[PDB]
Design a protein around this ligand. Structure first.
Ligand SMILES: [Zn+2]
Length: 262
């Protein structure tokens, strides 16, 4: 499967977003545009609690041909934020572009940002459900999304990741980034108080609708050069001819769903 941009310049067939298979053609898809003013306020949406997010550590990061992804190996978890139970971190990856107004999947009141970061987690234990219900739990996977925009200061917390890119230009490559903690990436805990919530799917095949999304309103800031690093050092093909950018899924319709916030 492919993103539009790469389908045009690829040397072999591939399904574009509108022609994706799986549950990608269903009714509870992501990303969506969030009309901040239409989202209902909910008190049950308390703050989140992080475990392991602060310990420096080496991570395995890799170029899967669709994005840059670092494996989290259940070495951290979250709770609170209205979540019915703890969720352990599996992986993290990003979506970006070289133009400041078209790098994120979700949008706020029609505005798109430089990049978007997805931290995927899965429900801790298994809870009893009835056979008659939907096969997969609608809140099975919990992802945290952060919007990224250009700033003046060089973001030191992202430096290790940016460096690592040099070692994985082509697909299938891997490496070990310098010791860092997940907390080094996110903004200060006090800014993580406001966020939007809604049920949806994954933004890649098979687009399974078993995700509880969380989009924080506070954007992470990176120096322009740091953002461009991704487009400049990563490639979609082994021949190193097509830069990796615009790896974003076109918006989907909200439908019967409603969004709530804190
Ligand atoms: Zn993603």
């Amino acid at each position: 499967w492919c993103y539009e941009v790469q389908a045009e310049s690829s040397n072999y067939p591939c399904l574009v977003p509108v022609k994706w298979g799986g549950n990608c053609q269903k009714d509870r898809q992501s990303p969506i545009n969030i009309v901040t003013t239409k989202a209902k306020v909910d008190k049950k949406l308390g703050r989140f609690f992080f475990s392991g997010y602060d310990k420096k550590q080496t991570w395995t990061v890799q170029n899967n041909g669709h994005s840059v992804m670092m494996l989290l190996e259940n070495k951290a978890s979250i709770s609170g934020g209205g979540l019915p139970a703890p969720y352990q971190a599996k992986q993290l990856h990003l979506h970006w572009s070289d133009l400041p107004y078209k790098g994120s999947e979700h949008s706020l009141d029609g505005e798109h940002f430089a990049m978007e970061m997805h931290i995927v987690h899965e429900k801790e234990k298994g809870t009893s459900r009835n056979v008659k219900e939907a096969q997969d739990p609608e809140d099975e996977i919990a992802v945290l999304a952060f919007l990224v925009e250009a700033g003046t200061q060089v973001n030191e917390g992202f430096q290790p990741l940016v460096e690592a890119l040099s070692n994985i230009p082509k697909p299938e490559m891997s490496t070990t980034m310098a010791e860092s903690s997940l907390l080094d990436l996110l903004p200060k805990e006090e800014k993580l108080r406001h966020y939007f919530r809604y049920l949806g799917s994954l933004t890649t095949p098979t687009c399974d609708e078993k995700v509880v999304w969380t989009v924080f309103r506070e954007p992470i800031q990176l120096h322009r050069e740091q953002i461009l690093a991704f487009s400049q050092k990563l490639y979609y093909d082994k021949e190193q001819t097509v830069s990796m950018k615009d790896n974003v899924r076109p918006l989907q319709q909200l439908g019967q769903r409603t969004v709530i916030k804190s």
